[PDB]
Ligand SMILES: C=CC1=C(C)/C(=C/c2[nH]c(/C=C3N=C(/C=C4\NC(=O)C(C)=C4C=C)C(C)=C\3CCC(=O)O)c(CCC(=O)O)c2C)NC1=O
């Protein structure tokens with residue numbers, strides 16, 4: 705749980721709410737710890753500018769090879785929540801991810817998705833059906849995905865929330881995604897070796913494309929340098945499996 709977090713009480717309220725919702729969804733799963741490189745938990749660094757503070761929590765279950773919740777703060781103003789549930793390819797589940805970035809003046813970016821791992825870039829039929837049933841959410845300020853964002857599903861939300869009502873609507877949609885995802889993980893069956901390979905490739909591709917995110921990289925570089933940032937992005941955030 706998040707009562708021991710040093711960052712949490714200082715983060716944007718939407719970020720606090722979403723972190724609680726994610727922890728609540730994971731709490732009663734068959735969790736084991738997942739050891740990050742160098743058993744990383746808390747880390748802080750500064751070069752010539754602002755300090756970056758990061759808290760990492762990571763778990764695994766039989767269906768999810770790596771469940772990573774990262775909270776971060778740059779200086780006084782910039783707050784970040786990062787979460788990815790990396791599936792075990794044997795079960796063919798999609799990739800849950802979300803990213804929230806907030807400054808003093810409010811949340812600038814809120815993105816969440818259940819991303820495909822199939823070569824045809826479609827979600828499994830059960831997900832399509834369940835997601836369609838939620839209906840189209842209405843948000844006033846949508847943002848267009850960057851070029852490397854071809855990895856995201858047609859259900860991807862990428863917005864700037866315009867008011868508290870939209871903040872709460874976005875959090876609820878993420879809770880709905882997680883409820884669907886946790887349910888489908890109970891009914892998933894181990895796949896064939898050939899299908900497992902296809903899902904593994906989809907996850908590798910997701911990770912390679914997420915590494916092209918310069919907005920993330922530049923934050924890390926300004927606090928820790930180029931070599932540290934490359935190691936962090938490739939080995940901690942978006943590790944390529946074999
Ligand atoms: C220490 C960790 C960490 C940092 C520092 C970080 C920074 C970060 N991510 C950003 C955007 C972004 N973040 C994402 C998406 C994602 N990013 C993910 O990590 C995941 C899992 C998704 C999607 C599920 C996208 C698409 C953008 C916008 C990129 C752009 O505008 O070019 C931005 C710009 C925000 C804005 O334009 O308003 C910053 C500063 N994100 C982090 O996770």
Ligand SMILES: [O+]
Nearest residue numbers: 772788941942
């Ligand atoms: O991650």
